[PDB]
Amino acid sequence: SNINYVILTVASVDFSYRETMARLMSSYSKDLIDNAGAKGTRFGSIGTGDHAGSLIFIQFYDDLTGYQKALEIQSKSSVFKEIMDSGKANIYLRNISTSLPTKFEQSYEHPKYIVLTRAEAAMSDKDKFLNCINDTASCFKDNGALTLRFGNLLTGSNVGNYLLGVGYPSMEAIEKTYDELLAHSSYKELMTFAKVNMRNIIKIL
Amino acid sequence: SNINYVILTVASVDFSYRETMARLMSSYSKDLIDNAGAKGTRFGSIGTGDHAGSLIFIQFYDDLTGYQKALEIQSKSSVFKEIMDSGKANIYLRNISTSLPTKFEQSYEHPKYIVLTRAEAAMSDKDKFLNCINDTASCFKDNGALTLRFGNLLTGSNVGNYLLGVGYPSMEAIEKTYDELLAHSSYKELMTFAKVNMRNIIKIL
Amino acid sequence: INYVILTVASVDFSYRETMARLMSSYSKDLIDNAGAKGTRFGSIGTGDHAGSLIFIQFYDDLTGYQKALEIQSKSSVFKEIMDSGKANIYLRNISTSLPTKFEQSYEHPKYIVLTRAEAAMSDKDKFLNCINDTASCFKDNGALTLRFGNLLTGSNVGNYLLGVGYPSMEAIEKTYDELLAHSSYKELMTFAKVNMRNIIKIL
Amino acid sequence: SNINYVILTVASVDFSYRETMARLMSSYSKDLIDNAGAKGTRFGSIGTGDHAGSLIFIQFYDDLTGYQKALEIQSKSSVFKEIMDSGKANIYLRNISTSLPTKFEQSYEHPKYIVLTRAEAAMSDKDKFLNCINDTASCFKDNGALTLRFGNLLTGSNVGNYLLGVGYPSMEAIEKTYDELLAHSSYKELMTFAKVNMRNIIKIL
Amino acid sequence: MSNINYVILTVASVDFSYRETMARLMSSYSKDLIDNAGAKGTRFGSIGTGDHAGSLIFIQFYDDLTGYQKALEIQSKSSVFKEIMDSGKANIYLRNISTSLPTKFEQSYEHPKYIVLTRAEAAMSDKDKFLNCINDTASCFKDNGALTLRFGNLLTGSNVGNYLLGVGYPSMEAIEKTYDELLAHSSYKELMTFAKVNMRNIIKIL
Ligand SMILES: [Cl-]
Ligand SMILES: [Cl-]
Ligand SMILES: [Cl-]
Ligand SMILES: [Cl-]
Ligand SMILES: [Cl-]
Ligand SMILES: [Cl-]
């Protein structure tokens, strides 16, 4: 119960409806934050990879009951109905991840960018993994990283993959983080037992 | 909260380990039924399609709270650790589905076969879909069907698809059901606004 | 050695009877003029192609198939299907059909189970052995026809393919009840990986 | 510069336009042979596999400058413009292959069918590969094969795969060629270090 | 017609340990192509984003396809190339060729630290509308620090016909500032009415 949960949803959206949608979604966020007990949300545009241009919504819950309450909010929500009736937004992926305890100094600052990284590794290496993450915590915080969350995808066609989400105020902070990170022993160790199979930048809208 | 939830897990398993697996799984099932509040499980091999020969595990919960307790049960389970440590079972897919109220007389008979059907349709046709399912209930029951569950995928690459699960005592009962169903007006009607994109048989082990 | 041609098309649900009509005109044509040793036409009941329609042709030689191709170009029935815009052929492959020790029936099946597997080409003989050692599993429990060979074309070229005709689904159940608990089957599982199994309903 | 090149283009084409397409394509071929220096072309429908019913165009050049002159002919060609403007043809794949010197007696006979075979193998086995092809050159010629070209895909998602193209006057010649080939020592040896991942028949239109 | 140039893009998966060795081998191989094949430059880097994150990418620029043919003849004779292939540590799994069309953009000679590749689907009949938009936004890029810009269509591969844009940058800050301006520019919003971006990725020059 020290474990938390993250819902990640991805939709293709007509380009014209993008700004409309971000405004509707902040309304929909306040509703989840106030009534479903959501511990924050993020909404942004995926900037990189094959889903570039898709929009992503991220929800944080302490327990899966929270998400279940969020599902009851959807059914009753006018803003949600409007987006689905528009015919301009198509949800094509939704998956849930655990969020595990890390030794990382969380900041309250809303990030402008998020880097999600996904990797394949044995479930038996879960602790090795967690140690590397904690050993490089200062690579991130020192170079401007705001938030760090880490866990495993519980659902979908990448079930079991480890996932890392890191919030930044700028792309400079990303560059400076990755300069240090790639020349750090714990990172080079990670690369002996974990295969990164995805890395992408989201722009918070 | 009239809604229930189904978790579906699929894994590739060495043919030799199949028997041992089933035996370990029924122990793990007892665990979930008694301690996680699981309202039943199914374990079988996928008989058809591209995943022919993979094994599938199905869990039913009234709430997502239930599934969270089940996750806590995993971390502590020796039976579960053994399966994972064997290197003979690889989980490559897990998704969650809703289960909606349907006008169908459920039997408690353990099914010998399950048929999963998955379809694409607008979320705005949700009620037309459910009405058709209810108008055809007698096709199923009359020809031997044991159980009928229905809802949408909450997670995964097919998020949003409608999903139908039906339990059967025999393949004859499947033949007789489909003989009637294909020639039923409500079915013909469903096929004007829903496209089946997958159908498969599971053999309960 | 014989040959089997398998063609798969996605068809609109509303076009399904027109399709069944135009295909019956077409089979007679191939049987009588191409030297086709039979055809089957059905809907794929399972898998990710559930709802597609499948057409199966049997030839003793590929020269038979070449004649069939020359019958297509002149066929009105074929022209109508393609001009309909309601049928989209998306797969066509050719398979060998090897001699097996199985007693064939003339009874038109109601269902066909297709099973496809990956195995070394050096295991060809062991494979055929297993298939002949479990011939009785099928015939005992009602199987009508059995064909076995390798895909000569397409993305699964080289895979072994097994086609079995049945009068009912009860017969499939009883067959697989016996088959899965047979020694030769468990041995086949040591060197062959089934990567696909599907039921066709003969229309 | 003993190496030649082969461009292969694949398009989906409305069935009704097929005959017109063919007529326009032999015009466009004349233009390439006469002005681009193309050393022959072939146009046909793909009879098997997942691209059954697509049309394919094959161009032969001694040098890539040839193909660059071809590109210059396109921009000027009315025939080509018309095909594009029709909305009836959609080029969805084009790749380039080397064509390596083989000890095979080439015929000038217009083929009726072509069989393309594609295989995966080490680049360090290039010579063992070519020697097999040369040892079996009689299997093809003796049984009716007209032309044989062999090389590696330079471009595409199958870059590096070996590609064989063999022309035939009829299906019987294909069947007789494979009856002999499959039971030849050099062929059996090729299969110890090469994996065929595709084989398909093209009907010359 | 001969105002068109050509770009070869090759992508390989490489063991992490071999990546530094590889970059050093590759600069030798580049000299060879620049001096003997007539290559008008090369770029070598790691793909930082997308499903190919961690793969290495090699980019070659030629005025003519004859240039690339000479390059192919250089490979067969190159010891550096043989070593890489014999290592068993590098696997080329994609190579495609793109046109490079004339654009109204002030090219810099500064070696970039990052490249952004963008790929889009659009009718071939919109080719000129496309080029106009690219030229109308040229200042967005140059103003905010972009070094080079190349634009054209994939000639080969499973995305044959897609438009492809490659832009060089000195830093990630320059990318951020470029995209801040670009996304709020009329010509960009117009481009998005007839072109669908289906891929965008950052390469780090090694
Ligand atoms: Cl990372
Ligand atoms: Cl099974
Ligand atoms: Cl159904
Ligand atoms: Cl089977
Ligand atoms: Cl072959
Ligand atoms: Cl862009």
Side-chain angles (χ1 to χ4, degrees), chain A residues 1-29 31-62 64-68 70-71 73-75 77-109 111 113-125 127-140 142-205, chain B residues 1-22 24-29 31-49 51-68 70-71 73-75 77-84 86-111 113-125 127-194 196-205, chain C residues 1-27 29-47 49-66 68-73 75-78 80-82 84-85 87-105 107 109 111-123 125-138 140-203, chain D residues 1-22 24-29 31-68 70-71 73-125 127-187 189-194 196-202 204-205, chain E residues 1-30 32-50 52-69 71-76 78-105 107-112 114-141 143-206:
Chain A
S1 59
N2 299 163
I3 302 80
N4 297 345
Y5 303 82
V6 189
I7 296 43
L8 303 110
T9 308
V10 178
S12 53
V13 183
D14 288 352
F15 193 79
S16 43
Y17 201 68
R18 257 211 192 198
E19 297 179 315
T20 305
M21 202 171 143
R23 291 186 292 256
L24 287 158
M25 290 297 293
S26 57
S27 240
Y28 179 73
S29 289
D31 197 349
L32 296 171
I33 285 170
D34 300 342
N35 312 348
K39 300 296 164 81
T41 70
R42 309 277 189 245
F43 185 71
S45 150
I46 295 155
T48 60
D50 276 357
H51 309 262
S54 300
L55 308 177
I56 186 154
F57 186 59
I58 295 167
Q59 310 168 71
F60 304 118
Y61 298 101
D62 290 7
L64 288 178
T65 300
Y67 182 50
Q68 206 191 315
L71 295 173
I73 292 283
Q74 275 187 31
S75 50
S77 177
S78 276
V79 159
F80 188 81
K81 186 180 164 47
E82 187 182 332
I83 300 176
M84 301 299 87
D85 284 351
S86 87
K88 287 158 190 254
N90 168 223
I91 292 163
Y92 66 95
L93 193 60
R94 175 184 311 110
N95 279 306
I96 305 182
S97 188
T98 61
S99 184
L100 308 179
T102 63
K103 297 179 189 160
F104 176 91
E105 178 130 36
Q106 302 298 313
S107 210
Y108 290 90
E109 195 174 319
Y113 299 83
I114 297 179
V115 176
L116 295 174
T117 314
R118 191 183 58 200
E120 185 184 354
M123 288 298 332
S124 85
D125 300 327
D127 306 52
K128 299 216 273 185
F129 222 115
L130 193 52
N131 283 3
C132 288
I133 296 331
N134 307 295
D135 268 341
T136 43
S138 14
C139 283
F140 291 99
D142 292 323
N143 293 300
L146 297 183
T147 50
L148 181 148
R149 272 181 264 251
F150 168 76
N152 295 96
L153 279 152
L154 281 181
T155 66
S157 305
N158 292 78
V159 54
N161 282 176
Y162 292 78
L163 189 68
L164 180 72
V166 179
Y168 298 95
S170 66
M171 271 165 276
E172 188 173 47
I174 295 172
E175 180 176 355
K176 300 305 178 189
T177 298
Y178 278 89
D179 286 336
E180 193 159 335
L181 198 63
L182 301 165
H184 192 287
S185 5
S186 287
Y187 182 83
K188 290 174 261 154
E189 203 213 303
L190 177 73
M191 294 303 83
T192 74
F193 64 82
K195 189 180 103 168
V196 171
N197 66 34
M198 186 235 248
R199 187 179 299 111
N200 285 306
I201 302 161
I202 301 153
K203 181 162 194 179
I204 303 315
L205 296 166
Chain B
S1 53
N2 245 139
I3 326 82
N4 288 341
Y5 303 88
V6 189
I7 290 78
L8 303 92
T9 303
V10 177
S12 66
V13 174
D14 302 18
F15 187 85
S16 40
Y17 202 47
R18 261 206 189 170
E19 275 188 296
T20 295
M21 185 76 172
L24 288 167
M25 282 314 290
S26 55
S27 184
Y28 184 71
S29 277
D31 201 353
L32 293 170
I33 291 160
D34 299 322
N35 302 335
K39 292 294 162 102
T41 62
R42 311 281 186 242
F43 181 65
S45 69
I46 294 161
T48 50
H51 307 267
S54 298
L55 310 194
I56 189 170
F57 185 58
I58 299 188
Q59 311 169 54
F60 308 93
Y61 299 101
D62 286 320
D63 295 317
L64 289 181
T65 290
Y67 183 51
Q68 191 162 328
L71 278 176
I73 288 300
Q74 288 193 348
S75 56
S77 175
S78 35
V79 172
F80 189 92
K81 172 162 193 59
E82 188 185 343
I83 288 176
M84 295 304 111
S86 75
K88 297 159 185 262
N90 174 231
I91 293 170
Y92 62 96
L93 194 64
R94 181 191 294 125
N95 283 317
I96 302 173
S97 178
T98 55
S99 179
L100 306 181
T102 65
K103 287 156 189 199
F104 180 95
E105 195 166 344
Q106 303 296 352
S107 171
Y108 281 100
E109 191 191 310
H110 198 79
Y113 299 96
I114 292 167
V115 179
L116 290 174
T117 311
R118 187 174 65 199
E120 278 158 50
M123 219 70 167
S124 85
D125 290 9
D127 295 313
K128 288 213 291 162
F129 221 126
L130 183 43
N131 293 332
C132 296
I133 294 320
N134 293 335
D135 271 310
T136 57
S138 64
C139 278
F140 291 97
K141 201 71 198 153
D142 293 9
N143 294 276
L146 310 170
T147 55
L148 191 138
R149 305 287 171 187
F150 169 68
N152 299 83
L153 283 139
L154 262 182
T155 72
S157 310
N158 282 78
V159 62
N161 286 182
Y162 293 83
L163 196 58
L164 190 68
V166 180
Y168 294 92
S170 73
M171 294 200 216
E172 179 188 26
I174 297 169
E175 191 175 350
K176 299 310 140 207
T177 293
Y178 275 89
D179 278 342
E180 194 169 338
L181 189 72
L182 277 171
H184 184 296
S185 52
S186 277
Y187 181 85
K188 285 175 256 189
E189 205 208 315
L190 182 52
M191 299 300 100
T192 64
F193 66 89
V196 168
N197 69 33
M198 177 259 249
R199 192 194 280 114
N200 285 303
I201 316 176
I202 308 171
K203 182 185 193 188
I204 293 303
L205 292 169
Chain C
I1 294 35
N2 280 353
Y3 296 92
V4 179
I5 296 14
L6 303 96
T7 314
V8 185
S10 86
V11 182
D12 295 330
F13 201 77
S14 58
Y15 195 68
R16 277 253 220 148
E17 242 193 53
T18 292
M19 197 71 179
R21 196 228 322 290
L22 295 174
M23 293 305 311
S24 36
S25 170
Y26 185 76
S27 266
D29 200 18
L30 295 163
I31 289 168
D32 290 293
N33 297 66
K37 309 305 201 93
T39 69
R40 298 272 173 261
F41 173 71
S43 56
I44 295 151
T46 56
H49 306 283
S52 281
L53 302 173
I54 186 182
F55 193 62
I56 308 171
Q57 313 172 72
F58 310 118
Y59 298 104
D60 280 350
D61 54 50
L62 294 180
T63 272
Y65 182 48
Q66 183 161 2
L69 296 195
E70 286 157 15
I71 280 297
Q72 271 190 76
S73 41
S75 182
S76 290
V77 139
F78 180 86
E80 181 160 313
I81 282 192
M82 302 278 98
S84 73
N88 163 230
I89 298 160
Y90 69 83
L91 192 47
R92 177 185 303 110
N93 287 303
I94 313 182
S95 189
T96 65
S97 186
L98 308 176
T100 69
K101 295 202 172 193
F102 186 93
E103 206 163 42
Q104 305 297 333
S105 186
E107 195 186 307
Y111 297 87
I112 292 140
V113 171
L114 294 185
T115 296
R116 194 181 57 201
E118 184 169 30
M121 282 279 286
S122 61
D123 297 309
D125 290 303
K126 297 202 295 172
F127 218 121
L128 180 54
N129 258 55
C130 291
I131 293 337
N132 296 300
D133 254 313
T134 58
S136 64
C137 264
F138 298 96
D140 285 339
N141 288 312
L144 307 178
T145 50
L146 168 155
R147 334 260 198 192
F148 165 83
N150 292 94
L151 278 142
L152 285 192
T153 65
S155 291
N156 292 83
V157 66
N159 285 197
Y160 293 84
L161 187 69
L162 188 77
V164 186
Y166 296 101
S168 71
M169 297 199 216
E170 181 170 48
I172 305 179
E173 176 172 355
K174 294 318 179 202
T175 299
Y176 277 87
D177 279 359
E178 199 153 306
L179 199 72
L180 285 158
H182 188 283
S183 57
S184 287
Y185 182 86
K186 277 160 284 197
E187 195 201 329
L188 182 74
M189 292 302 94
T190 77
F191 64 85
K193 191 206 64 161
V194 170
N195 65 28
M196 186 252 228
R197 192 182 296 116
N198 285 296
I199 320 206
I200 310 157
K201 189 166 174 184
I202 297 298
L203 296 145
Chain D
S1 94
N2 64 342
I3 306 106
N4 293 349
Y5 304 90
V6 183
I7 306 81
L8 303 89
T9 303
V10 182
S12 63
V13 183
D14 282 326
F15 184 85
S16 56
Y17 196 57
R18 276 211 188 186
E19 202 193 285
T20 296
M21 184 71 197
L24 287 159
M25 281 310 275
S26 53
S27 162
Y28 181 83
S29 287
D31 198 4
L32 293 165
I33 290 185
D34 297 358
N35 314 357
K39 300 291 163 83
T41 78
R42 311 218 169 287
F43 182 58
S45 67
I46 299 175
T48 58
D50 305 299
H51 307 273
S54 293
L55 308 182
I56 181 166
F57 189 50
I58 311 174
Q59 307 161 69
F60 304 111
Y61 299 102
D62 278 18
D63 284 327
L64 290 186
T65 320
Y67 179 61
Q68 190 168 327
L71 295 178
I73 299 332
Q74 277 186 43
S75 50
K76 299 159 171 266
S77 198
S78 326
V79 179
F80 179 79
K81 150 189 196 67
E82 187 179 340
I83 291 169
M84 298 304 85
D85 287 20
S86 76
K88 301 208 173 280
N90 174 219
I91 290 188
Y92 66 83
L93 178 63
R94 183 195 295 115
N95 281 313
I96 303 171
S97 197
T98 56
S99 186
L100 301 171
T102 72
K103 296 170 178 188
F104 178 90
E105 201 167 354
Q106 301 287 327
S107 180
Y108 285 115
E109 182 184 338
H110 184 35
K112 179 157 173 82
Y113 307 104
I114 293 168
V115 175
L116 283 176
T117 316
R118 192 181 65 200
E120 215 165 314
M123 282 303 302
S124 57
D125 286 357
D127 301 330
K128 316 203 289 129
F129 221 113
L130 187 68
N131 296 328
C132 297
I133 290 311
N134 292 343
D135 285 320
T136 55
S138 34
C139 300
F140 291 97
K141 193 51 161 197
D142 292 332
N143 294 225
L146 305 170
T147 55
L148 194 152
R149 311 263 164 229
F150 164 75
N152 296 84
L153 281 145
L154 282 165
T155 60
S157 309
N158 294 84
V159 51
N161 285 176
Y162 290 84
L163 195 72
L164 187 63
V166 183
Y168 294 99
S170 89
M171 297 253 170
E172 183 202 54
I174 296 169
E175 173 176 345
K176 293 309 133 225
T177 279
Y178 282 94
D179 274 335
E180 175 154 331
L181 216 94
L182 301 149
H184 189 296
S185 40
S186 300
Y187 179 86
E189 201 187 318
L190 191 44
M191 297 311 86
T192 64
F193 64 73
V196 173
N197 59 39
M198 178 256 269
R199 181 182 298 125
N200 282 310
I201 303 175
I202 297 163
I204 297 312
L205 289 175
Chain E
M1 170 56 212
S2 66
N3 271 124
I4 280 60
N5 297 335
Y6 305 83
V7 189
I8 297 63
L9 306 99
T10 306
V11 181
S13 61
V14 168
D15 300 1
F16 185 91
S17 33
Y18 196 58
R19 289 173 204 186
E20 288 175 352
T21 297
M22 179 102 173
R24 293 187 291 266
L25 291 166
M26 284 303 289
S27 72
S28 227
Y29 183 72
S30 285
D32 200 350
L33 295 175
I34 290 177
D35 298 349
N36 285 62
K40 298 299 191 78
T42 65
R43 306 270 193 246
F44 189 75
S46 74
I47 289 151
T49 59
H52 307 263
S55 296
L56 298 185
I57 183 170
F58 184 57
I59 303 163
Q60 306 174 64
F61 306 112
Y62 299 105
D63 282 1
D64 298 296
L65 293 178
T66 298
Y68 179 52
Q69 186 166 343
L72 284 178
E73 284 144 10
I74 294 311
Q75 273 183 41
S76 42
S78 181
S79 321
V80 184
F81 186 86
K82 174 175 188 66
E83 185 166 339
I84 291 169
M85 296 307 140
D86 283 3
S87 83
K89 301 178 182 285
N91 171 234
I92 290 167
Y93 66 93
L94 191 56
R95 183 187 294 116
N96 276 310
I97 305 191
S98 185
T99 60
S100 184
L101 304 185
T103 77
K104 301 185 167 190
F105 179 94
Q107 299 304 344
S108 174
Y109 313 84
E110 190 184 310
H111 284 290
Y114 300 98
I115 293 181
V116 172
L117 289 182
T118 296
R119 193 183 58 198
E121 187 175 356
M124 274 302 273
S125 36
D126 295 317
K127 72 192 155 280
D128 294 297
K129 298 207 285 170
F130 218 126
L131 184 50
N132 292 347
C133 299
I134 293 317
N135 294 332
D136 268 302
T137 50
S139 59
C140 275
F141 293 93
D143 285 346
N144 291 290
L147 304 177
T148 41
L149 187 145
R150 301 180 227 239
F151 161 79
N153 297 99
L154 283 146
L155 288 186
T156 61
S158 309
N159 290 72
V160 64
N162 283 189
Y163 294 76
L164 184 66
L165 186 73
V167 177
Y169 296 89
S171 77
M172 288 198 214
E173 187 183 35
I175 300 174
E176 175 161 3
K177 298 303 173 196
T178 291
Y179 277 92
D180 288 332
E181 189 168 327
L182 192 76
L183 296 175
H185 189 287
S186 41
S187 291
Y188 193 75
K189 276 173 268 171
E190 197 192 329
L191 183 55
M192 299 297 90
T193 59
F194 66 92
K196 195 188 83 188
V197 164
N198 62 32
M199 182 248 251
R200 191 185 295 109
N201 284 310
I202 309 171
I203 305 176
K204 185 168 176 188
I205 298 297
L206 296 171

